[PDB]
Write an enzyme that holds these catalytic residues in place. Structure first.
Site, mmCIF file in Angstrom:
data_model
loop_
_atom_site.group_PDB
_atom_site.id
_atom_site.type_symbol
_atom_site.label_atom_id
_atom_site.label_comp_id
_atom_site.label_asym_id
_atom_site.label_seq_id
_atom_site.Cartn_x
_atom_site.Cartn_y
_atom_site.Cartn_z
ATOM 1 N N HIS A 94 -10.023 0.685 3.629
ATOM 2 C CA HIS A 94 -8.754 1.501 2.290
ATOM 3 C C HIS A 94 -9.784 1.506 1.080
ATOM 4 O O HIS A 94 -10.240 0.276 1.448
ATOM 5 C CB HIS A 94 -7.680 0.525 2.631
ATOM 6 C CG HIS A 94 -6.811 0.659 4.095
ATOM 7 N ND1 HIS A 94 -7.225 0.166 5.228
ATOM 8 C CD2 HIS A 94 -5.663 1.024 4.297
ATOM 9 C CE1 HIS A 94 -6.902 0.390 5.889
ATOM 10 N NE2 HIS A 94 -5.848 1.131 5.680
ATOM 11 N N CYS A 132 -1.568 -5.929 0.984
ATOM 12 C CA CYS A 132 -1.122 -5.862 1.909
ATOM 13 C C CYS A 132 0.094 -5.940 2.344
ATOM 14 O O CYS A 132 1.106 -5.597 2.914
ATOM 15 C CB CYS A 132 -2.445 -6.009 2.912
ATOM 16 S SG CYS A 132 -3.639 -5.580 3.023
#
Ligand SMILES: COCCN[C@@H](N)NCCCCN
Length: 275
Positions: A166, A267
């Site tokens: 990511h 996250c």
């Protein structure tokens, strides 16, 4: 002054099924699910107990093994929330509880519905004055288009991300106009893409370990300019680089168990500023 202000943190308990069924890009040691819960409790403790944010803890859903990684299902800018359409099929029902929590917080909700669109919030870098969105295995151009339409106030620019990473696998905001950036070639190419596309350039803090470039910056008024970063026992030489931020309140936070399932610091929370 305004950048990084937050009043609320949305988090979500992790499920026992995580150790066994969570999506894992790279395989290694198994996840000590009990230990992971302890590290996650320490992390929520920093956000709520130490820093004073109002923490909304969503309950764990055993049928959604990744439900702890709330960042991927919601992107919040000011008073508007983009509920994403995660790339991974198994994660899509995580938006239900998120939608309900954000409704309760009285946010303007936009739900990504184009079935040709996917977006993971971990691919979204909001710098305070624009968005960069990684084009990755989980986020495609159509997802970036929807984010741009939802936050029309801000410029949005895409960045290619290789190898099932990511965007924020190697970067994050470490302060106003300050990007923490890994030293890998991929991280460095991503940064120069971002720098060339921006209206004007950012300062940068280069850290030796890409993963250690993922940190959480918080402006807590009358406490400090806070940075949660990976611990010196996880990434000693990156931790030393963060120490150069003498004006920051530096808080080491371990994520060693959830890192095995690609879980980094950003996250595990969605940060909201409610005025
Ligand atoms: C900041 O993003 C770093 C990569 N992981 C984020 N995206 N989601 C957590 C992983 C879910 C799959 N087990």
């Amino acid at each position: 002054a305004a950048f990084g202000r937050a009043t609320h943190a949305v988090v979500r308990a992790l499920p026992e099924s995580l150790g066994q069924h969570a999506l894992r890009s790279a395989k290694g040691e198994e996840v000590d699910v009990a230990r992971a819960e302890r590290q996650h409790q320490l992390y929520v403790g920093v956000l709520g107990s130490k820093l004073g944010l109002q923490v909304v803890e969503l309950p764990a859903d055993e049928s959604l093994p990744d439900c702890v990684f709330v960042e991927d299902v919601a992107v919040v800018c000011e008073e508007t929330a983009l509920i994403t359409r995660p790339g991974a099929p198994s994660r899509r029902k995580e938006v239900d509880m998120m939608k309900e929590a954000l409704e309760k917080l009285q946010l303007n909700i936009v739900e990504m519905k184009d079935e040709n669109a996917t977006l993971d919030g971990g691919d979204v870098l909001f710098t305070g004055r624009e968005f960069f969105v990684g084009l990755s295995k989980r986020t495609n151009q159509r997802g970036a288009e929807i984010l741009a339409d939802t936050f029309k106030d801000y410029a949005v620019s895409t960045v290619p991300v290789a190898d099932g990473l990511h965007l924020k696998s190697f970067c994050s905001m470490a302060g106003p106009n300050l990007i923490a950036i890994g030293s890998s070639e991929s991280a460095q190419k991503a940064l120069k893409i971002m720098q060339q596309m921006s209206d004007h350039r950012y300062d940068k803090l280069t850290v030796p370990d890409d993963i250690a470039a993922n940190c959480i910056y918080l402006n807590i008024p009358n406490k400090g300019h806070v940075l949660l970063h990976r611990t010196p026992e996880e990434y000693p030489e990156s931790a030393k680089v963060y120490e150069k931020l003498k004006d920051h309140m530096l808080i080491p936070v371990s994520m060693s168990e959830l890192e095995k399932v690609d879980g980094l610091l950003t996250c595990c929370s969605v940060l909201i500023n409610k005025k």
